[PDB]
UniProtKB/Swiss-Prot annotation, chain D:
Gene name of this polypeptide: gag
Family per similarity comment: Belongs to the totivirus major capsid protein family.
Subcellular compartments: Virion
Residue spans crossing the bilayer: none
Protein name: Major capsid protein
Top-level taxon: Viruses
Function comment: Capsid protein self-assembles to form an icosahedral capsid with a T=2 symmetry, about 40 nm in diameter, and consisting of 60 capsid proteins asymmetric dimers. The capsid encapsulates the genomic dsRNA and the polymerase and remains intact following cell entry to protect the dsRNA from degradation and to prevent unfavorable antiviral responses in the host cell during all the replication cycle of the virus. Nascent transcripts are transcribed within the structural confines of the virion and are extruded into the cytoplasm.
């Protein structure tokens, strides 16, 4: 769904057609200008940060596994006459439709019996999913995965790719997969009984020598060596695949270019009228394509256990009964060919749509994790209250699109309630502390991180405990579309806090909200302050994340209640503007303004520049030549948003109906 | 009748087409949120179970035996001209109709004489019944039956499959039956005198190679090895079967799929004009598709002796008189094709219609068994007063439909008073003791159950004496639509047990009604209560079921005087998500509230999900409006043009609609 | 073929029965791949003009031309200036100003 | 208190800490608080008269 | 801005080419383009004294098309305004004050 994911990008940013990705890691952000103004009891001070880079990091590494499941049928592309006055498939009219379009009327009773059983299981989403993955393996087939490389690196702790991904070796993306080929047989017209558990698809003219090899490899098993996002393990779709081609198919060549895969997809969709089936596969890949690099070491807990990708079962009966597919197809929405027309024009735009989607999900799960398990809307019952359709199960895409609705605060709508794709909320839905394996870089590691072994040596491999899941990403593209108090991602804001009395060289902050505001100010001024949690006896630091220049309360790494002892004597000066002061006095007022946003992308510690021309808009209106909006709002999936209502605690988040 | 069985299903239940059954046991039910409360002089203790599963276990096994009986003729199908004003065959118009036809002139006088006997032989219910069973045998053929498997187990008593079903070998449903084929001869139109005691049917065009194999096996003896419900014992319907098909009958293929049986049925109903015959066969199979696993150990008395199935004799004389069947048939009700049209569209919906019917019957036979013989509407005379027709004998479908009418509280209407199918009320009307076999687990069994021995070592085969039949199923689909105080299936309920501090926990229940509600609500709260009768000296436990989680008064297994001593310092916490009664003092007040309902099904201790399209309420009007429409768009290939439009680039072309 | 004629003339074509028989022309178009047409050369300076497979070819050699986009096979003559487009430029009056 | 906290409560306010510790003693409960800054301990049972 | 195919942007028009190199000079980016007709390299940094670009620095009267090298854009003088990668329609609004 192009028009949906295209809306998530910020109004100032309009990306160009091509993007030459040449690495397994891409930073994306913006260069903003901050105009700070400070006032306290001592006096006033005015400064200005001329260039500030706020960015996340996203990679092409994510452990996933495929399962074949049975899902709903997509009834789009079938002729409009077989459907009655309502949006329902009548078997009374299928008998009539097949009868009028043949001379041999002996086969009508047999044809109707088989058609009735097959039409209620038609889904080509799994075939297009694999065909799309083959396109990007050939295009970006020079990305290197080194086993003894770094995953996260702060200075105290470190995670290697040996950990998080065991049973892996060093390989390029083209060298990862060695796909076998399934038998692409020809369906001779005259066969009366459709062979069971084998799909048949239509084709335009002669099946090319290259087109055979693509369809053969798309249906086969995926068995990777290196952990890659677009080369994840998938079960075998089918053994055989019939093709009702008037001209006979040619034998498989063995080799194909990425350009040849586009020609295979464009023909397969046009012949079968499977435009809505492609839209499902497009959204399903947008989830998987890229995975987040964690903000802090604790945010690696999300990516330990392998998330399951629900691939629908491959079934189709267009090859057997080509009478059912004619020139007047049935569609629910009039904008039902937009997603394919967008991809075929601008293939590399999927990267930006993928980054936009996975950001929105992992940002909002930062809030859902902090919700107490004694309210109406909680981690267990947030999807069920949101959805207003009838899917098979609240899994895959339904979970992800619910989180996008909660982020943007708008009603998202799909034509069919499809439940296919990655489920992320697995690490969240379990009342157990997660054991992230880490490497010790400095001797003073146990003071900061909640480590098992309290005495360590540089080189030792230990384990750290994570109870509450912290935010994996900060808002960048979705910055200021709706501002929560937790992130505090405002354009303009006036922070007011009262400074605690400095007894010896230490200031006690008993309250939780005041402590968050204090360290948030001192960070924007650019003062590396270090405080001691009195309950646990572990040191917290506002400079936890360098990439995103902000302080979240989850950097304390202790759910519950505590009091902090801030060290006011050892306040280091890392980055100093003219605003920056060391000695606060009385009531601290900081008023900042953010202006002059401009998007910038970094890859392999150099600037990554966009190539090609400017993207012209392709989009169809609500009506072509349709008079009355026959609402048909019974079967269509609808996802209602939730607004965060702030309360006194500040540690707990709460959702309400707007 | 699809219509009346559809209304039995709950409002929240939204069924889909396909149901992938892969076992011989299904736990259908619903998930509800129970808000329990315990109020006392000391204070209130609140609990909340967010997902409480109330289930009824249903199996695919059950001993049945078919017998060929004489039943009324179904006159729906014959041309409307030969019928008089009253609605009976006016012989004289038959002789007129045969004379003005395409019949051989020398046969008219001899055939007209036979008409008086042969035209009143119209009942195809037996053939359609067997052909429906062949459809489901080949569809769900992979289900297994093990000999030494657990039929029932409640911890104390165990009942194996060897006990109830001797002469039983372990085998799959597909490998159970080995059906021999009956002769399908071609009717010679130039036959001198019609052969009575040999049925002759009509057919459209040519009898296919597979249709011969299906009709051959349908009119044959069912001799099963494993006691399956859809493969029970049936006698040989007929030896030979004539088929008036001018196009010759092809010889038997040998093999056929489940889709080929649907092809055979749709041709047979259409040619013979026998839709009311199919409606009778649909309701027959709805009774005897699935049998309920007994709720308690002593509720196995219903399934000891084999209940007889009444199959009406196969008799059809359409082959001899082709002229009398045409396109203008005589029918009583206008909605006479609705039952077939429903089955062809949604075959797997019969499973839901079957469980709805047996749950309605076995619930009502529960509270019919607890009435004294000295009454107006009693055990023996509940069918006679309800029935306002003229059936041959009050058996089969009449007894099952009258029980459904009592449950729902509505008027059930059928077009013909047909008396065919299973008779359930067999063990009830006998009014004698039934001896169910049991294998013991513990050594302290015969205190609880009314056993034949008083001391029994573990692993011994004993006998339980059941006098009054307890309810076999708890109401789940019919929950709080026609509520009785016996089952106590309310949304809101409360009980007030009155105790004084002078009593050291010990309470005596003089009343029987509130004893039942106390013991039931304590089990929702997850507390194992063990009462002891003061008069007799037996013991009862509220934990006497692992499906519904309720206490019915028939679990006492004795009718006498009510003096139940419950000691409230021996209450043990058994389940999870439970409220604790540590030490009560004064008057106790228990209460619960069920708020929302969500349909759930379980199989092999895993969730069984419904897949496929959205099932609609098919009406007679929804198809014949498309017949009124006719697709009246004159079938004329009108090709509309597209004017090319030039813009800035001129290299690429752009087409407009006008 | 009838729907292409309807686009050219700009009128509504009506047949009594929706019959689907005859030649199908749109075959090489829908494939959307490169086609390899054979050619015998006359001059030696051929492969500058045509997108040939070889860069130097002696006269009388059998070579191959790579055709990607299909050029028009016929120019409009009978349908000249009835439904005019700017691509063909089949006007009665036309002018161009080179500055 | 929230369920995420495993029984442990921090009293930032001094006024309601006094009322909590006092009412718990009427109810006959021996509470022993520990100061986070200094590291001393206080017990509500510090009298046998009032 | 012309579409950057490989690492090269074709400027067919004469006026648009003059405005492009005039912007990139004020930002302070030493851009080098190749005249396709003559086959000689033009540079916007021709005169250091006067900080502006005239069209006569091409040194070819007549009509031509320029192939601008977008990969080899050096950074001689950088203010905070200065960017290397232009995208779509470029707008530059400057004000000159405080002459001495």
């Amino acid at each position: 769904m192009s028009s949906l994911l295209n809306s998530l990008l910020p109004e100032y940013f309009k990306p160009k057609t091509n993007l030459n990705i040449n690495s397994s890691r891409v930073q994306y952000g913006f260069n903003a200008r901050i105009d700070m103004q400070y006032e306290d009891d001592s006096g006033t001070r005015k400064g200005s940060r001329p260039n500030a880079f706020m960015s996340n990091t996203v990679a092409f590494i994510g452990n996933y596994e495929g399962i074949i499941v049975d899902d709903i049928p997509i009834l789009d592309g079938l002729r409009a006459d077989i459907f009655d006055t309502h949006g329902d498939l009548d078997m009374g009219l299928v008998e009539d439709a097949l009868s009028k379009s043949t001379m041999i009327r002996r086969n009508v009773p047999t044809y109707t019996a088989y058609a009735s059983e097959l039409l209620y299981k038609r889904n080509l989403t799994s075939l297009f999913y694999n065909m799309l993955r083959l396109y990007y393996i050939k295009k970006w087939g020079s990305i290197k995965y080194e086993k003894d490389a770094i995953f996260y690196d702060n200075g105290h702790a470190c995670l290697l790719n040996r950990q998080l991904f065991p049973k892996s070796r060093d390989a390029s993306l083209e060298s990862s997969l060695s796909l076998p080929e399934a038998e692409i047989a020809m369906l001779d017209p005259g066969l009366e009984f459709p062979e069971e558990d084998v799909p048949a698809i239509l084709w335009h003219g002669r099946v090319s020598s290259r087109a055979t090899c693509i369809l053969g490899q798309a249906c086969s098993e995926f068995a990777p060596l290196a952990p890659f996002s677009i080369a994840h393990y998938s079960p075998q779709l089918t053994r055989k695949l019939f093709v009702n081609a008037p001209a006979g198919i040619e034998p498989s060549s063995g080799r194909y270019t990425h350009e040849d895969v586009k020609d295979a997809i464009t023909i397969l969709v046009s012949a079968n009228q499977a435009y809505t089936d492609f839209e499902a596969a497009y959204l399903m890949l947008a989830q998987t394509l890229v995975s987040p690099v964690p903000r802090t070491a604790e945010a690696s807990a999300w990516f330990i256990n392998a998330g399951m990708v629900n691939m629908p079962t491959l079934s189709c009966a267009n090859g057997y009964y080509p009478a059912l597919t004619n020139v007047n197809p049935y569609h629910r929405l009039d904008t039902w060919k937009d997603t394919l027309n967008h991809w075929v024009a601008y293939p590399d735009m999927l990267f930006y749509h993928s980054v936009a989607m996975i950001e929105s999900c992992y940002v909002e799960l930062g809030n859902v994790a902090r919700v107490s398990d004694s309210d109406a809307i909680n981690k267990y019952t947030f999807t069920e209250l949101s959805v207003q359709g009838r899917p098979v199960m609240n899994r895959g895409i339904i979970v992800d699109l619910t989180l996008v609705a909660m982020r943007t605060g708008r009603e998202i709508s799909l034509p069919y309630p499809v439940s296919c794709g990655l489920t992320r909320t697995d690490a969240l839905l379990q009342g157990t502390e997660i054991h992230v394996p880490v490497v010790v870089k400095d001797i003073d590691m146990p003071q900061y991180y909640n480590a098992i072994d309290k005495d360590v040596i540089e080189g030792q491999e230990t384990v750290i405990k994570v109870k509450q899941l912290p935010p994996a990403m900060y808002p960048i593209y979705t910055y200021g579309i709706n501002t929560t108090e937790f992130y505090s991602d405002h354009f303009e804001d006036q922070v007011q806090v009262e400074m605690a009395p400095i007894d010896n060289g230490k200031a006690v902050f008993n309250d939780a909200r005041k402590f968050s505001k204090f360290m948030s100010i001192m960070r924007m001024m650019g003062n590396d302050v270090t405080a001691t949690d009195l309950v646990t006896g572990r040191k917290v630091s506002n400079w936890a994340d360098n990439s995103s220049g902000r302080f979240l309360y989850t950097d304390v790494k202790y759910e519950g209640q505590t009091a902090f002892l801030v060290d006011m004597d050892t306040v280091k000066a890392r980055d100093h503007c003219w605003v920056s002061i060391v000695d606060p006095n009385g009531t601290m007022n900081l008023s900042y303004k953010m202006t002059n946003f401009r998007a910038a992308m970094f890859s392999r510690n150099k600037p990554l520049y966009m190539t090609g021309g400017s993207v012209r808009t392709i989009a169809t209106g609500n009506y072509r030549d349709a008079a009355e909006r026959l609402r048909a709002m019974d079967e269509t999936l609808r996802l209602k948003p939730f607004k965060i209502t702030e309360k006194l605690d500040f540690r707990v988040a709460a959702y309400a109906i707007p």
